[PDB]
Design a protein around this ligand. Structure first.
Ligand code: MET
Ligand code: MET
Ligand code: MET
Ligand code: MET
Ligand SMILES: [Mn+2]
Ligand SMILES: [Mn+2]
Ligand SMILES: [Mn+2]
Ligand SMILES: [Mn+2]
Ligand SMILES: [Mn+2]
Ligand SMILES: [Mn+2]
Ligand SMILES: [Mn+2]
Ligand SMILES: [Mn+2]
Ligand SMILES: [Mn+2]
Ligand SMILES: [Mn+2]
Ligand SMILES: [Mn+2]
Ligand SMILES: [Mn+2]
Ligand SMILES: [Mn+2]
Lengths: 266, 261, 259, 259
């Protein structure tokens, strides 16, 4: 069963969600050619632990040895931070998860490292759109398939493919719980959404074919065809009216809630 | 019945050979006019070390300063990656060796950079044909000379010459071991091939005359006459009844084994 | 290190070999269109256990769920007896191994079910010849490679191909022991044969390409091109000056031994 | 380069071989104490010319003055038939070659005349075994060395030595062609055999040391140490996967072919 969070859980989830967003607003300043993913990891780790008084959820999670995941270029997800420097032209996903007093906030974004090819930029833009469209359909009475279909149609119209081997997930006082949030599928299928459900929408969208391959560290997934892949992620609450993005950043213009979306249509 | 078993060493050589082949498959998509050979070298080195969790065997080998060899046009072999960009019309050999947990896989292939002249295309095709002919005679009871004869005949019939001062070699847990695999000679001579032997066939074929000379850096060999030179290389295992190419790529149509098409 | 059977081991292997042969001699009378391979399996099972006072070696061996293997048409080896009826035109391998007081006799033969097409008959014939040829070169001083070369030359010369990833095997008080016996290769290579070695020669020979594919049950191997495949097997003793076929049937005219 | 025979050549070589063998079958009844080798020569000459409509190949061949060779006792080979009678206790090699319509068949055999010295019969039997073992390794892919090695090991195990100064040879529409077939040497070296080659295996095996001495007649070779020497010879075809003995006699029990 999918857990239904109480009003109290939801307030604590807003808090965790705001912190994870703040790690991303903070780290952007440090991202330039030459900085290593491990130095970014150390910066996020110290911010989360020393300033936010919280804990990086990935750390030691099923063996994962670092505090954040850093996925660059043809890396699809779960890249382990290391001493390899960022190179101008890279696209970088920084994926944060913060646990504040037992509650998880999970979110990621793409960064452009110095000057980047314009078509890498567009992959990143289109992928964020896919995420935003997936969020736009969330409301009580929608079905999980609604989210997959709308992401999949937008990616595919743009000549990209959706990664099927990884999905979004319920999130709460546990990092990964039901449901599996697939980023492909058919409208009206899968479980029905209810107020108080909380889950991530985190589409991985590849420039070429959808298949991935795992490296020998057990975590780093790359595109089998070595083409680019981008991801963005938010933690989403189902509200009485529709959705609330718990991990919204201050640099984002997408409406935080169905209520803010209704207002702007006036 | 029982499913066939292979010695451990042989499966670890098949892994090393498949990795070496994948580096060539990978690097093809990066080769175009304007890319420097030192840039190819960095791309290959990072893919071997960071993704394959393996080691570029050429690196610091007898002092060689790079991770791959890049040999262009009248360069015969062992060209040192550098800051010179590839130009339209270049022929380029990229020669990889990977060491995966101590086992080596050694292979090279010719790339046509942009629109190349027909005579450079013909040199590359016939050199590849020479290599595949050499591989085709490999089986228990073949003699090393069979490989040199078949290559020499195909090269010379088509107007080309064989470089004599470089040869293929045994390979396994060491990068270079006995035997010397000459790309010229006479059938039925030299040692008899035995099942489990692994060695390379890597003919260097010249547009003009066979003589080469070594430059100042002690690695870069060039044709004496300054005409083109092409090379292709595979790592080959002698099997119970024929050959198995350990470094075969997905883009190759030649059969991986004798059986076996 | 290949085990060398002692004279007593040899008497015991002869008994097991004769029993495995008599299972094929027996089951032949039951094979016709309409009979299911799970019926054949039950009949062989009851014969080995209740009559011979022996054990069907394949039963529960690495999980194999039946007492014999029944490979039809494009199936290469290890087919699992089941509810499908034999059809007119099928070729069928019944592969038997009996354990009689701890000693194994392993043998298989092809059956032509009703009227069979000429190309199926030819394949079965040439595979039998291949197996007999492989048997004929066995003597002390020969090498395992002599068996693979003679089989593969006879197959290929007649347009057929040799399955490469499955082989014959030493046999004794254990079902599968050293050496691997490839049905392809070069004469004079591999281990040297000595009196008292016992092993199988069980070539699988394909109508089209050599390659095979394992199905979902983890056992049933089929030709990759779905063309026909045939197998014949015998358990073979290296004697002082040639061979002895421990699993010879009385329907066979090839000599029991080289002398 | 060794010549390769066509199928028509081979049918003709079969005829020449069979005729050569038939001379040895015919001559047996005339071998007894008191018969001279020149009488055996004349009888074989007349049989070949008058009855087989063929020609004795040794006649006038490089000066040789007779139709057959007859080598007795310590004579190793190429004895010239003459007026000396066979004596109780002799061992005698009769070496025949017939040309039939241009094709040659070359074969010899030992005869024991009456009561022979006691280790003379075994010399002759071991020499025939040596020849048979040489034949038994012939197939495409074998090496000439394989013949040399198997013969030499059997001879030396029995305390005998192999004559090195003479050898077997290619044969066909010519009496002596490539390659030299040495009766000593090392497995897996020398010329590799191919289907359609035809050559002789004709080991000369000495009771004592291997060295020979040539007599004044330029032909008759004897053992330097004067101990007994024996020889047997057949013409051998390399077939698709083994051998065919073109000069087999009806008195022999070794198989005509590997098949
Ligand atoms: C090493 S655990 C990383 C998990 C990732 N934050 C996710 O979105 O599930
Ligand atoms: C299910 S075990 C199959 C064994 C088969 N009789 C063989 O030859 O090895
Ligand atoms: C600089 S060492 C390069 C050696 C090369 N890969 C070979 O085939 O031997
Ligand atoms: C005097 S010619 C005799 C030749 C002999 N028959 C041989 O085998 O060569
Ligand atoms: Mn990526
Ligand atoms: Mn995440
Ligand atoms: Mn997530
Ligand atoms: Mn078996
Ligand atoms: Mn060149
Ligand atoms: Mn090499
Ligand atoms: Mn190389
Ligand atoms: Mn069996
Ligand atoms: Mn079959
Ligand atoms: Mn004599
Ligand atoms: Mn002769
Ligand atoms: Mn003769
Ligand atoms: Mn040889």
């Amino acid at each position: 069963t999918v857990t239904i969070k109480t009003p109290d859980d939801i307030e604590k989830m807003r808090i965790a969600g705001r912190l994870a967003a703040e790690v991303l607003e903070m780290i952007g300043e440090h991202i330039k050619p030459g900085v290593t993913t491990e130095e970014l990891d150390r910066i996020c780790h110290d911010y989360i632990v020393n300033e936010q008084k919280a804990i990086p959820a990935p750390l030691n999670y099923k063996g994962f040895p670092k505090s954040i995941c850093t996925s660059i270029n043809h890396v699809v997800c779960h890249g382990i931070p290391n001493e390899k420097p960022l190179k101008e032209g890279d696209i970088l996903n920084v994926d944060i998860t913060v646990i504040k007093d037992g509650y998880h906030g999970d979110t990621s974004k793409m960064f452009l490292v110095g000057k980047t090819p314009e078509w890498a930029d567009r992959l990143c833009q289109i992928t964020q759109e896919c995420m935003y469209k997936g969020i736009s359909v969330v409301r009580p009475g929608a079905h999980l398939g609604d989210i997959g279909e709308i992401i999949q149609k937008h990616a595919e119209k743009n000549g990209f493919s959706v990664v099927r081997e990884y999905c979004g997930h319920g999130i709460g006082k546990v990092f990964h719980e039901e449901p599996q949030v697939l980023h492909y599928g058919r409208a009206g299928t899968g479980i029905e959404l209810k107020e108080g459900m909380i889950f991530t929408i985190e589409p991985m969208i590849n420039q070429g074919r959808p298949e991935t391959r795992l490296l020998g560290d057990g975590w780093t997934a790359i595109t089998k065809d070595r083409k680019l892949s981008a991801q963005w992620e938010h933690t989403v609450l189902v509200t009485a009216d529709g959705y609330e993005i718990l991990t919204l950043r201050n640099d984002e213009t997408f409406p935080r809630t169905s209520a803010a979306e209704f207002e702007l249509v006036d």
